[PDB]
């Protein structure tokens, strides 16, 4: 997951953001049948931002 380029960090961040907003639309419809999918996308965004921070501090020193 760290292997990706940071341009792919932006892409795979934005895809989770879009899916998260789509899950929200659904849930506001009331038909949110898979609640765990939300938290899964959120933690995935968390891991993504954290790994990019680790490539921040790493290398440049």
């Amino acid at each position: 997951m760290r292997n990706l380029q940071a341009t792919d960090f932006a892409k795979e961040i934005d895809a989770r953001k879009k899916e998260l907003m789509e899950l929200r639309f659904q849930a506001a419809a009331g038909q949110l049948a898979q609640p765990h999918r939300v938290r899964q996308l959120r933690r995935e965004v968390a891991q993504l931002n954290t790994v990019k921070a680790e490539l921040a501090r790493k290398g440049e020193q």
Binding site: D14, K18, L20, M21, R24, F25, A27, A28, A29
Partner: protein, 93 residues
């Protein structure tokens, strides 16, 4: 980014039966300048918007017993796009 500013669509007899006129209507982050929610809905649904109007809206209830209540606030937008521009199946409702 766009996606998290747009919040969740309105659901009512009004905004739905106003979906048929070509208007679309949904909640957003209260801190959100009109032009931002315009660009966000535009580049989330691939439509060009020629009209927006925005209103801040504040609720408040109270769960039984001592607990005072006070539901959280928000803001709502209504948009009108160019005649053909009507948004897709997520407008399908």
């Amino acid at each position: 980014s766009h996606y998290d500013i747009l919040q969740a669509p309105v659901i009512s007899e009004k905004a739905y039966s106003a979906m048929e006129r070509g208007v679309y209507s949904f909640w957003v982050s209260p801190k959100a300048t009109k032009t931002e929610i315009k660009d966000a809905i535009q580049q989330a649904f691939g439509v060009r918007v020629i009209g927006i109007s925005t209103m801040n809206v504040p609720g408040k209830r109270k769960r039984v017993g001592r607990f005072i209540g006070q539901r959280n606030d928000r803001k709502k937008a209504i948009v009108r796009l160019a005649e053909g521009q009507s948004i897709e199946a997520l407008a399908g409702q």
